[PDB]
């Protein structure tokens, strides 16, 4: 089991640098559109309390500059601007000839996606995270990473789901979907913001227990069962997300012969502590791997 | 913690992966300029995998024995016009130079150092991850049948350093391969026989970096005034499944920034190994050695 992200090449060919005044960050160029965080527009004196409508009104196409540094580098001309939630939709005069097939999806808590971290329009690293139940991610981002992009891929279509915007007071990160809505209803302004209390992603804990059984670690499997409905009611009071079955979990159920309901019962017992024992070398429940991960990695 | 498993963006290496077939055997290869590198056991008949005679096998080959195809991006009219064997790898010469060859070197990676892996099947990139070379010359990767010829690399400036070509999964979950000079890591053999790795060890210098990352995040309950010298720690390490600590400039920057000395963390390690005393560090109840000093310097700064 490793943290496995998609190959980033197709997304690399879409990264650009966006400049507005003396401010810069990353943007994503698809077709004739460049997407980027709207706080490019924001003077340093207005970061803590910005008026984005007033700021956008004071912009012309000419306020915005877009540079591509990767591939055959190019200057693009901004021929239109618009604001969509927390994102800027610039229109440019050239279409990206390396535009992949893509959609815009919103990731759900517990689901994994790949992030391409960039600075000044240059990809520097790639990693994968799961969206946390409190709609933050446990990333690795520094000043200037804003506009870095998160995505999944089904076959050859890339599903863009995340554009990075902020690091909260705790170690964690958040950003917006490409409809422009910030995950977790956080605000793109320079203010201290307190996230909700996080939860265990139940379906990923289940996936992880199936991975243990697949590896010969099954000491926690008992005949006792907890129904999904019973589990989900118990989950409300215990900081666990609602469990929603999928095809991937069922395949692990069929492969191991252990029913989902036996592991939901197991989670309720192990949540109190492992009483001296370990599971896959761990003393705590692991929710950072998905059923798809376990399926694919241990095919 | 602000620490993730950070790989280099794979686009450079994706544009170099190809599929190499010899008879009815297939795996991945690496296309750079007029050369395609792939594991030599693509030459071996399944009946003979357990005991190959790669010298005899190579004599038996002609240029026409090998077929190379690039499926991704712009595809492949690739004709093999030369072949050769270098250690456990084949070096094939092809008549088209890869137009997307990155600046590259071949360097052997050392235990404790991290590198990016591009996992591929039948010439198609499917995933990327990063690993640290274990002190017993294995990596804890995620590889299935057909991943052979997948590549591990690091990147310095514009220069890709290719350090690993995938070859085997040992009887534990664990993986090994060769450097591009042709030598298998750990002197394993590329043949279909059971092989036992040497015992693995904690990478002391990476554990030190991780504790520094803890201090940088305000997690410093484990820091005491007590110290253990490098010499005394390294003598302790031979007795306790830890690698020799070798300090570097990257570790020094961490020590200066935090104001906690390496030797304080060497003492902390000796205590934390015996037990975390019901506490955790960066969300872990056990020492973590899969993050390098360079990792912490880059990701936390
Ligand atoms: C009292 O203030 C705080 C209290 C407690 C926690 C806090 N967090 C933040 C906060 O996150 N600010 C956002 C900015 C806001 C406006 C979205 C921000 O700095 N994003 C970074 C990535 C950040 C930085 C650290 N690593 C993270 O990934 C980024 O790349 C860029 N920002 C700008 C801004 C202007 C121009 C170019 C760029 S580029 C402020 C804050
Ligand atoms: C009784 O012998 C054993 C006892 C105990 C543990 C063992 N492990 C291995 C062993 O690993 N063999 C090598 C192959 C050898 C010869 C280096 C191998 O299967 N490589 C795989 C990747 C492996 C497979 C599972 N996931 C891993 O990454 C691969 O991709 C390909 N192999 C071939 C082989 C021939 C033609 C095309 C391809 S393509 C043998 C063995």
Residue numbers in the entry:
A (entry chain A): 3 to 301
B (entry chain B): 1 to 301
The authors write:
The main protease (Mpro), also called 3CLpro (3C-like protease), represents an attractive antiviral drug target. Mpro is able to cleave pp1a and pp1ab at 11 sites, catalyzing the formation of a series of non-structural proteins critical for virus replication and transcription. In fact, a variety of studies previously demonstrated that only the dimeric form of Mpro exhibits enzymatic activity. Here, we showed that a peptidomimetic compound with benzothiazolyl ketone as warhead, YH-53, is an effective inhibitor of SARS-CoV-2, SARS-CoV, and MERS-CoV Mpros.
We also solved the crystal structures of YH-53 in complex with SARS-CoV and MERS-CoV Mpros at 2.04 Å and 1.99 Å resolutions, respectively. The SARS-CoV Mpro-YH-53 complex is crystallized in space group P1, while the MERS-CoV Mpro-YH-53 complex is crystallized in space group P212121. Compared overall, the SARS-CoV Mpro-YH-53 and MERS-CoV Mpro-YH-53 structures show high similarity with the SARS-CoV-2 Mpro-YH-53 structure, with the RMSD of equivalent Cɑ atoms being 1.040 Å and 1.322 Å, respectively. Particularly, YH-53 forms a C-S covalent bond with the catalytic cysteine residue of Mpros of SARS-CoV and MERS-CoV, and forms several hydrogen-bonding interactions with some conserved residues, as is the case with SARS-CoV-2 Mpro. The main differences for YH-53 interacting with Mpros of SARS-CoV-2, SARS-CoV, and MERS-CoV were observed at the P1′ and P3 subsites. In the case of the MERS-CoV Mpro-YH-53 structure, the benzothiazole ring of YH-53 flips over and moves outward from the active site when compared with SARS-CoV-2 Mpro-YH-53 and SARS-CoV Mpro-YH-53. This binding feature also helps to build a hydrogen-bonding interaction between the benzothiazole group and Ser144, but deprives the hydrogen-bonding interactions between YH-53 and residues Thr190 and Gln189. Furthermore, it is the nitrogen atom of the benzothiazole that interacts with His41, but not the sulfur atom, which forms a hydrogen bond. In addition, the main chain carbonyl group at the P2 subsite forms a hydrogen-bond interaction with a water molecule. YH-53 inhibits MERS-CoV Mpro with an IC50 value of 3.103 µM.
